[PDB]
Amino acid sequence: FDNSTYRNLQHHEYSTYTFLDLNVELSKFRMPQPSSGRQSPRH
Amino acid sequence: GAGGALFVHRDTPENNPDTPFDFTPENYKRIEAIVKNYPEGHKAAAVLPVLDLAQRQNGWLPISAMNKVAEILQVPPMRVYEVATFYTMYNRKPVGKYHIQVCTTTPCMLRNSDSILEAIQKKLGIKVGETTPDKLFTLIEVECLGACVNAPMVQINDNYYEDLTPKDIEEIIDELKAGKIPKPGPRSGRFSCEPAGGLTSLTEPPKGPGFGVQAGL
Amino acid sequence: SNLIEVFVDGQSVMVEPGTTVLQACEKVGMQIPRFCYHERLSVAGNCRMCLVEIEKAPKVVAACAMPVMKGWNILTNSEKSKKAREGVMEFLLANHPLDCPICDQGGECDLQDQSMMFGSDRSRFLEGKRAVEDKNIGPLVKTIMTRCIQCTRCIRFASEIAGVDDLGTTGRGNDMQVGTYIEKMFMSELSGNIIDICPVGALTSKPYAFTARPWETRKTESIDVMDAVG
Amino acid sequence: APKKTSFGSLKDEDRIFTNLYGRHDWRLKGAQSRGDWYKTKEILLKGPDWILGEVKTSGLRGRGGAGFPTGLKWSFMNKPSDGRPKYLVVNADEGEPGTCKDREIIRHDPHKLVEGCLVGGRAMGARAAYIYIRGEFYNEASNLQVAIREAYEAGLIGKNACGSGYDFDVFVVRGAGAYICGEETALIESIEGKQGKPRLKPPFPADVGVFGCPTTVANVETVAVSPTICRRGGAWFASFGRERNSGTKLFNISGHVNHPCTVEEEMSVPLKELIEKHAGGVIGGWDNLLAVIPGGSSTPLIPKSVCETVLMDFDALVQAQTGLGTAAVIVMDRSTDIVKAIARLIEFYKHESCGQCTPCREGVDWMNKVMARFVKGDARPAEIDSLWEISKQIEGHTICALGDGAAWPVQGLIRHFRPELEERMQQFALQHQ
Amino acid sequence: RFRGEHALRRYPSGEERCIACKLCEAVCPAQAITIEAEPRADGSRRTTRYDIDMTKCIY
Ligand SMILES: NC(=O)C1=CN([C@@H]2O[C@H](COP(=O)(O)OP(=O)(O)OC[C@H]3O[C@@H](n4cnc5c(N)ncnc54)[C@H](O)[C@@H]3O)[C@@H](O)[C@H]2O)C=CC1
Ligand SMILES: Cc1cc2nc3c(=O)[nH]c(=O)nc-3n(C[C@H](O)[C@H](O)[C@H](O)COP(=O)(O)O)c2cc1C
Ligand code: SF4
Ligand code: SF4
Ligand code: SF4
Ligand code: SF4
Ligand code: SF4
Ligand code: FES
Ligand code: FES
Ligand SMILES: [Mg+2]
Structure with missing residues (x-):
């Protein structure tokens, strides 16, 4: 048990597309989106 | 003081509607993933991320990038212009690396x-x-x-x-x-939001799960 | 029936549910000062000129957007309402240009008239004024953007009545501006109406420019023959 | 014995945010062993009414800054479904100067936030949770997404979310540099792909919110503590702080202090004890202190005369005419230009106005010009009272509460440091004539 | 302060001062002033007719 070490170094290796890559990865577990019944408010 | 940046657009040979811009196929996959999060019929909600995505591929936002986002999301271009000029993280001029x-x-x-x-x-x-x-x-x-x-x-x-x-x-x-x-x-040997010396609190070993749980649960 | 009773200055009136404070005051024949509210456009609530005091409420409400609540007592002429109108007129006139002698809106200006009727008679603004560049949206609607009070009536009319999404606001805060952001002609068969609904001389008629003043004109109520709508 | 009177010494056994300093695994495994994601299924199975009751019994007040009671506000979505989906929005904007609590919660304890989203959505009957995070917090958002990914893989969210039978989604949407997007309605507008311009209320988000659907907007701190309150119970959380000021609180102590930091502390701790214990005191000693802004730039500042005896809770600081705000203490010693700091805050507010409504859009810029002239001494004494009235006109006449936050620091400076303004004007006149 | 024969003045550049606001025409108790205006070739707001009937004027 060491409380003197800051582990949080994952972000150092984060690139420009890391957030969007994680979004693409998470797109698989998502529940189907609800629909208002239109394609757009202008439809 | 004053902002300095202009909020009108004047065409230039390096920034006009015919300036070449298009998303990469990987960026199109990311756009599909971004679009899916929002409810159907509310596709515009993706203006904020997708625009950012364009800036993450090009570096800045030429007027052609705004037009491309508007056409991809089927949002009127003036709405994308409003979003681009409102938020300060959007670069409507080239910046350094x-x-x-x-x-x-x-x-x-x-x-x-x-x-x-x-x-x-x-x-x-x-x-x-x-x-x-x-x-x-x-x-x-x-x-x-x-x-x-x-x-x-x-x-x-x-x-x-x-x-x-x-x-x-x-x-x-x-x-x-x-x-x-x-x-x-x-950059001072701190690597946290901690006090600069001593660590006034959070020195005990962290408590195990269920330590403070109330009765009947 | 479904009518609810509310009071405007201590006087009872029956209104439909969801009626705004402005419409209830209109039922007794009182007109609340306004700049951004138009009864044919969607409610905006941005100008803040319509703020009124409700009895036993510390905060003034926006009369053009707030639905009346049963048993409410509007107070359209209280000290709080008057001071709200004076402050809002002061903020509106702070950056406005000294353009009345050259402005076509001169004798027909809602800003001028409501300044005379509900605002103060003086300025305590001692800074420099903001100035913005003009937009060119075609040969019909002359544009002098410095005069704009940012009501957003033009944006709501173009989007909702005309069916065009060419107008908008770019930037934010003090520097927020109304325009197209690009060289675009706001061309449509209903375009000229944005001159009528604009309360100031920001949007004016280009063919009509400088020719007349409103007090000298004679009004003849007639019918149009340019089509079959009459 | 009940009704304690000396608050402000609580040990680490009663701190919710045990990984505040990020000295422990920020990932799921770590959280799991630290007590996170425990008995979630049991909590979910207890039902929304039980969950709502725990929040109500605790007395939990909104940690985003306004301090509205959390249980009552969350109970506003306990209506039956009307065909529209229901949503919970987590406010992770954190735009208030002096405030860094939500950043640390997101980067070092993201699973606390994810579980809080799940439990809050269950309480509200919500369908999914949208976490609107600051655009400048790229690494914090990426850590949050990693946490959500490993929660999805372990079946802690998504379809059935547990052995529970409840489906819940968690989405992270990033802003793009706009402080006004911290306001709940402006945040909702920015999620829907528009300019971050606040809406008028009514309607409240519980009636018409994001995508026009019933929505509840909750601060990251408020959401994170939600599961610990449920397992520990409402009574335990309340047992801290004065009456109507229950629970613990994250404080960001910055400015002229020896060790600026952030720390969890009991609610009603006196300001002096908090500053001198955790922050190492004021540089130059406690008698070097000039002024303190107790709750971020939106709250009026208080002088050393008040700072030595005021408690750090909502009602106590209201009685001191300032307000608790975001619990972001900014300390300024006798070595700083007190007018310049307030002028910089007013410049921040001038640069952060959305421009929608007249009193903010015009009067905050007007106040910025007046304050910049005050800094030099260009003005006359008769303008000071004038400036006061300008603020009064702005306050309470705007759509959004950014106008209040612009007008309150000026009122505080004029209320407590008028003689400095007058002597600056006298000096400028003396060397200019 | 003596009131005599009327005159139209210029700026030091030689440009006319009158911008055709028509306030003089509105205020005139005798209706002695007649004004017609249009945009000038350079877009300036100037008068094309500016008459004073000196036998209507009360000075
Ligand atoms: N955490 C941060 O970084 C920042 C925090 N703030 C703080 O935000 C505070 C002002 O926020 P406001 O939302 O304008 O205060 P508010 O009192 O109007 O409302 C705060 C919360 O209570 C809800 N609420 C209030 N009355 C309600 C009702 N009758 N029915 C249903 N819900 C109701 C609101 O929907 C909102 O969620 C300020 O005190 C400021 O300190 C400001 C800037 C940044
Ligand atoms: C200009 C402005 C900015 C705000 N920024 C934030 C913010 O960044 N984070 C936050 O939690 N609340 C912010 N608020 C207050 C929100 O209204 C608040 O989060 C919302 O009411 C729910 O917060 P709660 O959970 O504390 O009740 C801001 C308010 C205003 C007026
Ligand atoms: S719009 Fe009205 S107030 Fe403004 S210059 Fe024209 S006449 Fe004067
Ligand atoms: S141009 Fe006229 S209608 Fe359009 S926003 Fe300005 S004042 Fe309103
Ligand atoms: S108070 Fe300021 S930030 Fe809030 S809506 Fe009005 S202009 Fe926008
Ligand atoms: S029209 Fe009359 S009042 Fe107006 S500028 Fe010309 S001379 Fe002066
Ligand atoms: S009567 Fe003569 S002096 Fe009097 S306003 Fe008319 S033109 Fe001028
Ligand atoms: S008329 Fe109500 S805010 Fe403008
Ligand atoms: S990061 Fe908050 S003032 Fe600099
Ligand atoms: Mg007009």
Whole structure:
């Protein structure tokens, strides 16, 4: 048990597309989106 | 003081509706993933991320990028123009490879942020709005970045560099020029939001799960 | 029936549910000052000129957007309402240009008339004024953007009545501006109406420019023959 | 014995945010062993009414800054479904100068936030949770996405979310540099792909919110503590702080202090004890203190005369005419220009106005010009009272509460440091004539 | 302060001062002033007719 070490170094290796890559990865577990019944408010 | 940036667009040979812009196929996959999060019939909600995505591929936002986002999302182009001119993280002009943003708000200024600003200016030879002739750096001042405890701090292309000193800011510039990337975080042997010495609290071993659970659960 | 009773200055009136404070005051024949509210456009609530005091409420409400609540007592002429109107007129006139002698809106200006009726008679603004560049949206609607009070009536009319999404606001805060952001002609068969609904001389008629003043004109109510709508 | 009177010494056994300093695994495994994601299924199975009751019994007040009671506000979505989906929005904007609590919660304890989203959505009957995070917090958002990914893989969210039978989604949407997007309605507008311009209320988000659907907007701190309150119970959380000021609180102590930091502390701790214990005191000693802004720039500042005896809770600071705000203490010693700091705050507010409504859009810029002239001394004494009235006109006449936050620091400076303004004007006149 | 024969003045550049606001025409108790205006070739707001009937004027 060491409380003197800051582990949080994952972000150092984060690139420009890391957030969007994680979004693409998470797109698989998502529940189907609800629909208002239109394609757009202008439809 | 005053903003300096204009909120009208005038066509230029380098920024016109016929300036070449298109998403990469990988960026199109990412756009599909971004679009899916929102409810059907509310596709516009993706204007904020997708626009950002364009800037993450091109570097800035030419008017053709705004037109492409508007056409992809089937949103009127003036709505994308409104979004682009409202939010300050969108670059409607080219910037340097490294965008230095130094905080100068009151908590950050109280810890000698002007020393950092002058150190950057004398190290780069440019002012608080200009871009270095090598097109590597651009220096601006920004409002509170939410890293006040670590003030003075600077934000560079998604990396915070905190607890800055004039010697410290200069070295980061040297490391960025020579083709290396510097480690983000505090620069005073702190690597946290902790007190600078002693760790006044959170020294006990963390409690095990279910330690404080109430009866009947 | 479903009518609810509300009071405007201590006087009872029956209104439909969801009726705004402005419409209830209109039922007794009182007109609340306005700049951004138009009864044929969607409610905006941005100008803040319609703020009124409700009895036993510390905060003034926006009469053009707030639905009346049963048993409410509007107070359209209280000290709080008058001071709200004076402050809002002061903020509106702070950056406005001294353009009345050259403005076509001169004798027909809602800003001028409501300044005379509900605002103060003086300025305590001692700074410089903002100035913005003009937009060119075609040969019919002359544009002098410095005069704009940012009501956003033009944006709501173009989007909702005309069916075009060419107008908008770019920037934010003091520097926020109304325009197209690009060289675009706001061309449509209903375009000229944005001159009528604009309360100031920001949007004016280009063919009509400088020719007449409203007090000298004679009004003849007639019918149009340019089509079969009459 | 009940009704304690000396608050402000609580040990680490009663701190919710045990990984505040990020000295422990920020990933799921770490959280799991630290007590996170425990008995979630049991909590979910207890039902929304039980969950709502725990929040109500605790007395939990909104940690975003307004301090509205959390249980009552969350109970506003306990209506039956009307065909529209229900949503919970987590406010992770954190734009207030002096405030860094939500950043640390997101970067170092993201699973606390994810579990809080799940439990809050269950309480509200919500379908999914949208976490609107600051655009400048790229690494914090990426850590949050990693946490959500490993929660999805372990079946802690998504379809059935547990052995529970409840489907819940968690989405992270990033802003793009706009402090006004911290306001709940402006945040909702920015999620829907528009300019971050606040809406008028009514309607409240519980009636018409994001995508026009019933929505609840909750601060990251408020959401994170939600599961610990449920397992520990409402009574335990309340047992801290004065009456109507229950629970613990994150404080960001910055400015002219020896060790600026952030720390969890009991609610009603006196300001002096908090500053001198955790922050190492004021540089130059406690007698070097000039002024303190107790809750971020939106709250009026208080002088050393008040700072030595005021408690750090909502009602106590209201009685001191300032307000608790975001619990972001900014300390300024006798070595700073007190007018310059307030002028910089007013410049921040001038640069952060959305421009929608007249009193903010015009009067905050007007106040900025007046304050910049005050800093030099260009003005006359008769303008000071004038400036006061300008603030009064702005306050309470704007759509959004940014106008209040712009007008309150000026009122504080004029209320407590008028003689400095007058002597600056006298000096400028003396060397200019 | 003596009131005599009327005159139309210029700026020091030689440009006319009158911008055709028509306030003089509105205020005149005798209706002695007649004004017609249009945009000038350079877009300036100037008069094309400016008459004073000196036998209507009360000075
Ligand atoms: N955490 C941060 O970084 C920042 C925090 N703030 C703080 O935000 C505070 C002002 O926020 P406001 O939302 O304008 O205060 P508010 O009192 O109007 O409302 C706060 C919360 O209570 C809800 N609420 C209030 N009355 C309600 C009702 N009758 N029915 C249903 N819901 C109701 C609101 O929907 C909102 O969620 C300020 O005190 C400021 O300190 C400001 C800027 C940044
Ligand atoms: C200009 C402005 C900015 C705000 N920014 C934030 C913010 O960044 N984070 C936050 O939690 N609340 C912010 N608020 C307050 C929100 O209204 C608040 O979060 C919302 O009412 C729910 O917060 P609660 O959970 O504390 O009740 C802001 C308010 C205003 C007027
Ligand atoms: S719009 Fe009205 S107030 Fe403004 S210059 Fe024209 S006449 Fe005067
Ligand atoms: S141009 Fe006229 S209608 Fe359009 S926003 Fe300005 S004042 Fe309103
Ligand atoms: S008070 Fe300021 S930020 Fe809030 S809606 Fe009005 S102009 Fe926008
Ligand atoms: S029209 Fe009359 S009042 Fe107006 S500028 Fe000309 S001379 Fe003066
Ligand atoms: S009567 Fe003569 S002096 Fe009097 S306003 Fe008319 S033109 Fe001028
Ligand atoms: S004031 Fe500099 S990060 Fe907050
Ligand atoms: S008329 Fe109500 S805010 Fe403008
Ligand atoms: Mg008009």
